[PDB]
Structure formats: C-alpha cells, structure tokens
Tab-separated table of C-alpha atoms and ligand atoms in Angstrom:
chain	number	residue	atom	x	y	z
A	1	UNK	CA	-0.336	1.499	-8.358
A	2	UNK	CA	2.611	3.276	-10.026
A	3	UNK	CA	5.723	1.298	-11.035
A	4	UNK	CA	4.343	-2.124	-10.025
A	5	UNK	CA	3.518	-5.502	-11.619
A	6	UNK	CA	0.326	-7.432	-12.390
A	7	UNK	CA	-0.675	-9.654	-9.435
A	8	UNK	CA	-0.947	-13.419	-9.940
A	9	UNK	CA	-4.764	-13.817	-10.436
A	10	UNK	CA	-6.682	-14.556	-7.205
A	11	UNK	CA	-3.426	-14.628	-5.183
A	12	UNK	CA	-4.811	-12.040	-2.689
A	13	UNK	CA	-8.317	-13.438	-1.981
A	14	UNK	CA	-9.134	-10.902	0.784
A	15	UNK	CA	-8.980	-7.924	-1.667
A	16	UNK	CA	-12.219	-5.916	-2.142
A	17	UNK	CA	-13.277	-3.575	-4.991
A	18	UNK	CA	-15.629	-0.751	-3.817
A	19	UNK	CA	-18.011	1.309	-6.002
A	20	UNK	CA	-19.335	4.329	-4.096
A	21	UNK	CA	-22.402	6.419	-5.000
A	22	UNK	CA	-23.063	10.067	-4.165
A	23	UNK	CA	-26.215	12.002	-5.059
A	24	UNK	CA	-24.619	14.756	-7.199
A	25	UNK	CA	-21.907	13.020	-9.304
A	26	UNK	CA	-20.867	9.705	-10.982
A	27	UNK	CA	-19.453	6.669	-9.125
A	28	UNK	CA	-16.027	6.688	-7.467
A	29	UNK	CA	-13.856	3.694	-6.484
A	30	UNK	CA	-11.635	2.505	-3.628
A	31	UNK	CA	-9.973	-0.665	-2.372
A	32	UNK	CA	-10.541	-2.580	0.885
A	33	UNK	CA	-10.000	-6.006	2.502
A	34	UNK	CA	-12.198	-8.667	4.119
A	35	UNK	CA	-11.308	-9.253	7.796
A	36	UNK	CA	-14.475	-11.249	8.634
A	37	UNK	CA	-17.001	-13.013	6.392
A	38	UNK	CA	-19.334	-9.991	6.831
A	39	UNK	CA	-16.873	-7.085	7.413
A	40	UNK	CA	-14.580	-5.083	5.081
A	41	UNK	CA	-11.962	-2.588	6.336
A	42	UNK	CA	-11.222	0.547	4.270
A	43	UNK	CA	-10.701	4.327	4.545
A	44	UNK	CA	-13.319	6.721	5.997
A	45	UNK	CA	-12.932	9.134	3.045
A	46	UNK	CA	-14.449	6.339	0.869
A	47	UNK	CA	-17.870	6.794	2.578
A	48	UNK	CA	-20.983	7.700	0.548
A	49	UNK	CA	-24.761	7.326	0.118
A	50	UNK	CA	-24.375	3.634	-0.795
A	51	UNK	CA	-21.566	1.159	-1.631
A	52	UNK	CA	-21.286	-2.181	-3.464
A	53	UNK	CA	-18.421	-4.622	-2.797
A	54	UNK	CA	-16.993	-7.079	-5.375
A	55	UNK	CA	-14.934	-9.998	-3.977
A	56	UNK	CA	-13.022	-12.578	-6.050
A	57	UNK	CA	-11.950	-10.248	-8.919
A	58	UNK	CA	-8.783	-9.941	-11.017
A	59	UNK	CA	-9.852	-8.186	-14.245
A	60	UNK	CA	-12.705	-5.960	-13.070
A	61	UNK	CA	-14.151	-5.563	-16.618
A	62	UNK	CA	-14.612	-9.344	-17.148
A	63	UNK	CA	-17.416	-11.045	-15.173
A	64	UNK	CA	-16.610	-14.574	-13.936
A	65	UNK	CA	-17.843	-17.328	-11.582
A	66	UNK	CA	-15.338	-16.240	-8.855
A	67	UNK	CA	-17.157	-12.859	-8.469
A	68	UNK	CA	-19.308	-12.200	-5.403
A	69	UNK	CA	-21.134	-8.852	-5.640
A	70	UNK	CA	-22.295	-8.110	-2.099
A	71	UNK	CA	-24.604	-5.538	-0.504
A	72	UNK	CA	-23.496	-3.241	2.344
A	73	UNK	CA	-26.108	-2.712	5.078
A	74	UNK	CA	-24.245	-0.172	7.267
A	75	UNK	CA	-21.108	2.028	7.215
A	76	UNK	CA	-19.146	2.524	10.493
A	77	UNK	CA	-16.862	5.575	10.152
A	78	UNK	CA	-14.403	6.333	12.981
A	79	UNK	CA	-16.285	8.794	15.279
A	80	UNK	CA	-13.310	11.225	15.405
A	81	UNK	CA	-12.630	11.216	11.621
A	82	UNK	CA	-11.705	14.781	10.598
A	83	UNK	CA	-12.426	15.879	7.015
A	84	UNK	CA	-9.826	18.713	7.188
A	85	UNK	CA	-6.739	17.053	8.751
A	86	UNK	CA	-7.755	13.491	7.667
A	87	UNK	CA	-6.853	12.126	11.126
A	88	UNK	CA	-8.523	8.753	11.906
A	89	UNK	CA	-9.168	7.825	8.262
A	90	UNK	CA	-10.615	4.330	8.854
A	91	UNK	CA	-14.032	2.690	8.306
A	92	UNK	CA	-15.733	-0.724	8.705
A	93	UNK	CA	-18.432	-1.919	6.269
A	94	UNK	CA	-20.966	-4.518	7.463
A	95	UNK	CA	-22.162	-6.835	4.661
A	96	UNK	CA	-25.843	-7.852	4.518
A	97	UNK	CA	-24.824	-11.534	4.265
A	98	UNK	CA	-21.635	-13.515	4.952
A	99	UNK	CA	-19.441	-14.140	1.888
A	100	UNK	CA	-18.861	-17.661	0.544
A	101	UNK	CA	-15.402	-19.173	1.143
A	102	UNK	CA	-13.738	-20.338	-2.106
A	103	UNK	CA	-10.186	-20.470	-3.482
A	104	UNK	CA	-10.683	-16.876	-4.753
A	105	UNK	CA	-12.307	-15.417	-1.599
A	106	UNK	CA	-11.190	-15.570	2.057
A	107	UNK	CA	-10.532	-13.465	5.173
A	108	UNK	CA	-7.316	-11.905	6.443
A	109	UNK	CA	-7.544	-11.800	10.287
A	110	UNK	CA	-5.090	-9.998	12.565
A	111	UNK	CA	-2.604	-11.867	14.815
A	112	UNK	CA	-2.900	-11.299	18.573
A	113	UNK	CA	0.309	-9.204	18.609
A	114	UNK	CA	-0.316	-5.446	18.190
A	115	UNK	CA	3.278	-4.157	18.059
A	116	UNK	CA	4.469	-0.814	16.620
A	117	UNK	CA	6.305	-1.237	13.289
A	118	UNK	CA	9.447	0.988	12.992
A	119	UNK	CA	10.963	2.472	9.766
A	120	UNK	CA	13.367	0.510	7.544
A	121	UNK	CA	11.631	-2.640	6.248
A	122	UNK	CA	9.981	-3.390	2.881
A	123	UNK	CA	6.212	-4.041	2.616
A	124	UNK	CA	3.713	-4.588	-0.258
A	125	UNK	CA	0.456	-2.859	-1.336
A	126	UNK	CA	-2.136	-3.800	-3.995
A	127	UNK	CA	-4.995	-2.095	-5.864
A	128	UNK	CA	-6.831	-1.175	-9.087
A	129	UNK	CA	-5.809	2.516	-8.962
A	130	UNK	CA	-4.242	4.735	-11.645
A	131	UNK	CA	-0.823	3.700	-12.965
A	132	UNK	CA	0.206	7.305	-13.651
A	133	UNK	CA	-0.808	10.950	-13.277
A	134	UNK	CA	-2.491	11.030	-16.693
A	135	UNK	CA	-3.422	7.323	-16.782
A	136	UNK	CA	-6.677	5.552	-15.921
A	137	UNK	CA	-7.412	2.983	-13.218
A	138	UNK	CA	-5.918	-0.427	-14.040
A	139	UNK	CA	-8.258	-3.154	-15.340
A	140	UNK	CA	-6.122	-5.808	-13.537
A	141	UNK	CA	-5.068	-5.979	-9.878
A	142	UNK	CA	-1.508	-4.576	-9.559
A	143	UNK	CA	1.036	-4.605	-6.694
A	144	UNK	CA	4.350	-2.976	-5.669
A	145	UNK	CA	6.982	-3.355	-2.910
A	146	UNK	CA	7.793	-0.128	-0.986
A	147	UNK	CA	10.054	1.037	1.884
A	148	UNK	CA	8.800	2.238	5.284
A	149	UNK	CA	10.446	5.650	5.769
A	150	UNK	CA	11.489	7.702	8.803
A	151	UNK	CA	8.654	10.162	9.717
A	152	UNK	CA	10.751	13.205	8.747
A	153	UNK	CA	10.262	12.175	5.087
A	154	UNK	CA	6.512	13.064	5.368
A	155	UNK	CA	7.063	16.397	7.226
A	156	UNK	CA	5.732	18.417	4.243
A	157	UNK	CA	2.276	16.933	4.923
A	158	UNK	CA	1.700	19.399	7.743
A	159	UNK	CA	-1.022	17.286	9.448
A	160	UNK	CA	0.962	14.004	9.333
A	161	UNK	CA	1.695	12.327	12.711
A	162	UNK	CA	4.126	9.427	13.336
A	163	UNK	CA	2.013	7.767	16.050
A	164	UNK	CA	-1.151	7.713	13.880
A	165	UNK	CA	0.292	7.116	10.398
A	166	UNK	CA	2.988	5.308	8.371
A	167	UNK	CA	5.233	7.120	5.832
A	168	UNK	CA	5.526	4.842	2.777
A	169	UNK	CA	7.688	5.053	-0.382
A	170	UNK	CA	11.292	6.128	-1.106
A	171	UNK	CA	11.179	9.666	-2.658
A	172	UNK	CA	14.090	8.780	-5.001
A	173	UNK	CA	11.819	6.358	-6.922
A	174	UNK	CA	8.512	6.516	-8.817
A	175	UNK	CA	6.965	3.472	-7.070
A	176	UNK	CA	3.833	4.394	-5.056
A	177	UNK	CA	0.193	3.858	-4.169
A	178	UNK	CA	-1.977	6.449	-5.959
A	179	UNK	CA	-5.549	7.567	-6.735
A	180	UNK	CA	-7.941	4.600	-6.764
A	181	UNK	CA	-5.790	2.596	-4.285
A	182	UNK	CA	-7.450	4.270	-1.241
A	183	UNK	CA	-8.514	1.836	1.491
A	184	UNK	CA	-6.223	-1.017	0.349
A	185	UNK	CA	-3.890	-2.876	2.805
A	186	UNK	CA	-0.128	-2.540	3.247
A	187	UNK	CA	1.266	-5.981	4.141
A	188	UNK	CA	4.565	-6.429	6.022
A	189	UNK	CA	5.692	-10.097	6.012
A	190	UNK	CA	2.090	-11.222	5.384
A	191	UNK	CA	0.520	-9.062	8.142
A	192	UNK	CA	-1.627	-5.989	7.365
A	193	UNK	CA	-0.056	-2.926	9.066
A	194	UNK	CA	-1.432	0.080	7.075
A	195	UNK	CA	-4.337	1.467	4.973
A	196	UNK	CA	-3.814	3.783	1.945
A	197	UNK	CA	-4.977	7.302	2.912
A	198	UNK	CA	-3.603	10.227	0.852
A	199	UNK	CA	-0.673	11.887	-0.953
A	200	UNK	CA	0.350	14.454	-3.621
A	201	UNK	CA	-1.686	15.052	-6.796
A	202	UNK	CA	1.566	14.831	-8.816
A	203	UNK	CA	2.314	11.340	-7.422
A	204	UNK	CA	5.745	12.157	-5.921
A	205	UNK	CA	6.249	9.729	-2.982
A	206	UNK	CA	6.091	9.166	-0.087
A	207	UNK	CA	2.367	8.709	0.651
A	208	UNK	CA	0.486	8.532	3.981
A	209	UNK	CA	-1.166	5.348	5.362
A	210	UNK	CA	-3.334	4.825	8.490
A	211	UNK	CA	-1.354	2.952	11.204
A	212	UNK	CA	-3.538	-0.080	12.071
A	213	UNK	CA	-1.894	-0.916	15.447
A	214	UNK	CA	-3.277	2.335	16.936
A	215	UNK	CA	-6.914	1.465	16.045
A	216	UNK	CA	-6.976	-2.213	17.106
A	217	UNK	CA	-9.195	-1.503	20.208
A	218	UNK	CA	-11.759	0.383	18.115
A	219	UNK	CA	-11.882	-2.434	15.507
A	220	UNK	CA	-12.457	-5.118	18.186
A	221	UNK	CA	-15.156	-2.929	19.775
A	222	UNK	CA	-17.157	-2.655	16.515
A	223	UNK	CA	-16.820	-6.363	15.644
A	224	UNK	CA	-17.889	-7.572	19.119
A	225	UNK	CA	-21.080	-5.472	19.173
A	226	UNK	CA	-22.171	-6.421	15.616
B	301	LIG	C1	-16.678	8.814	-2.024
B	301	LIG	C2	-15.638	9.832	-2.032
B	301	LIG	O1	-14.400	9.270	-2.596
B	301	LIG	C3	-13.478	10.174	-2.971
B	301	LIG	O2	-13.622	11.367	-2.875
B	301	LIG	N1	-12.369	9.583	-3.480
B	301	LIG	C4	-12.225	8.137	-3.588
B	301	LIG	C5	-11.245	10.384	-3.951
B	301	LIG	C6	-9.999	10.317	-3.098
B	301	LIG	C7	-8.823	9.650	-3.366
B	301	LIG	C8	-8.527	8.759	-4.503
B	301	LIG	O3	-8.806	9.169	-5.703
B	301	LIG	O4	-8.105	7.626	-4.247
B	301	LIG	N2	-7.905	9.861	-2.327
B	301	LIG	C9	-6.534	9.341	-2.217
B	301	LIG	C10	-5.473	10.213	-2.858
B	301	LIG	C11	-5.797	11.459	-3.358
B	301	LIG	C12	-4.848	12.281	-3.955
B	301	LIG	C13	-3.550	11.879	-4.060
B	301	LIG	C14	-3.140	10.621	-3.556
B	301	LIG	C15	-1.797	10.175	-3.656
B	301	LIG	C16	-1.425	8.956	-3.168
B	301	LIG	C17	-2.361	8.123	-2.556
B	301	LIG	C18	-3.672	8.504	-2.455
B	301	LIG	C19	-4.112	9.766	-2.948
B	301	LIG	C20	-8.514	10.704	-1.395
B	301	LIG	C21	-8.022	11.216	-0.199
B	301	LIG	C22	-8.832	12.043	0.563
B	301	LIG	C23	-10.102	12.333	0.102
B	301	LIG	F1	-10.898	13.137	0.862
B	301	LIG	C24	-10.617	11.849	-1.083
B	301	LIG	C25	-9.808	11.009	-1.849
B	302	ZN	ZN1	-10.587	-15.829	-12.492
C-alpha cells in the first residue's frame, strides 16, 4: 500500500496473509480474504505448488495468540484464467479445517444483491505490500482510500475491460495498491467489490482489480459443490 495509514490492529478480521511456494525460487506473498470458515478468495496469479494461510495477524513478524496458521488442501483457479491477458484473475482456496471464530478472525460474506458498481465513489483496500517502488513489504497491515475511475483512465492497459474489471486510483495522486497487495479486497461502504490484480512496475496509478459482481455465479457454484 502506497500513501496509506497503519490499520487499527485486528480491525479487518477477514484479512488473510498468503505464503506461496514454487519449486525453483524462494517464497512469494499475496493477500486474500475469508468468505467462509474453510474458503479464502484471492487472485489466480497467486497460485503455486503449495500455500499457507495466516489469519488473525497485524504485525506479521511477531507471533501471537490471535494467529491461526492454516493448511490449504486444494486450489480452485478460474477455468478460463489467461496467463497472457490476465482475464479472469480469481481463485478460491479450500482450507483443510474450518477456522476458529474469535475477535481477530471472522468471515466476510456477500449480500444477496449483485449490482454493477459505477465510477465516482470512494472505496478502501488493505494489505502488507510494498510502500514504495524501492521499499519492502510492510510489517504491519496498511490501508488507503481510493477513487473508482471511469474506464478510459485504464485504456493504456491494452487488455483491460470495463465489464470484467474496476479501474482504481486517481492518477493525480500517489495513493495505490502495489506489489504484495495482490488478492486483497476492495471494500465500498463495507461490501467487497474488487480484488487487486495488476498495474505498472513504477507504481503510477490507476491499477486494475477483478470485478466481483461478474463472477458471483462461479463462486456460488464452487462453494455449493465443496
Ligand atoms: C506465485 C506467483 O506469485 C507472483 O508471481 N507474484 C505474487 C508476483 C505478482 C504481483 C505482486 O508482486 O503482487 N502482481 C501484482 C502487481 C505486479 C506489478 C505491478 C503492480 C502494480 C499494482 C498492483 C499490483 C501489481 C502480479 C500480477 C501478475 C502476475 F502474473 C504476478 C504478480
Ligand atoms: Zn494482536
């Protein structure tokens, strides 16, 4: 998160920290959020050989009683996910066991309404990602408020599409989601409407988020069968 503030500890108890293994390099990290006691929603580009999820964290370098370090048994990547265009960048992780409910850990379910969210309003995003181009991932959970932009503002991303994706962050400001914030939720008035997907290496906003409304049938289909 660039240009944001430190979150009040444990104020977003659905937030998930992901550590992803691949066979030929060191660990990488993403965000995510718990929508059922045994399911986390994140981005498909965060997939790997194996993944561990930490719930209940604020400072990720200091172990505490609120932590729940949970095993993932299966990864469900969207079947049409495209590694070139990055269309359909969404994934569900099934946890081996259900998480415990505490003050620091709980689910964020969707409302029944599935309406399209137009440009103009302010929303909020959170994560442990880098706080600058030459800076490291934050030790504490950070957050920032950003504007939903007209789709023309993301035209330069040649594979962007308005009906699949949100365009997030005023280009006149530095505020933005960045590397390490992948898979985290964008909340508009307390409802999750987007998922951090990608942007520019130099951090100039806006960035591109998956539009959740469009994938609601697929999400329901996975959860019902599992
Ligand atoms: C297990 C594999 O995991 C990885 O390979 N990971 C986690 C690296 C990775 C990241 C990241 O570091 O978070 N982002 C987001 C991203 C990248 C670049 C610029 C951005 C500006 C704004 C927001 C987000 C931006 C990706 C997008 C597509 C992609 F294929 C890979 C990545
Ligand atoms: Zn604590």
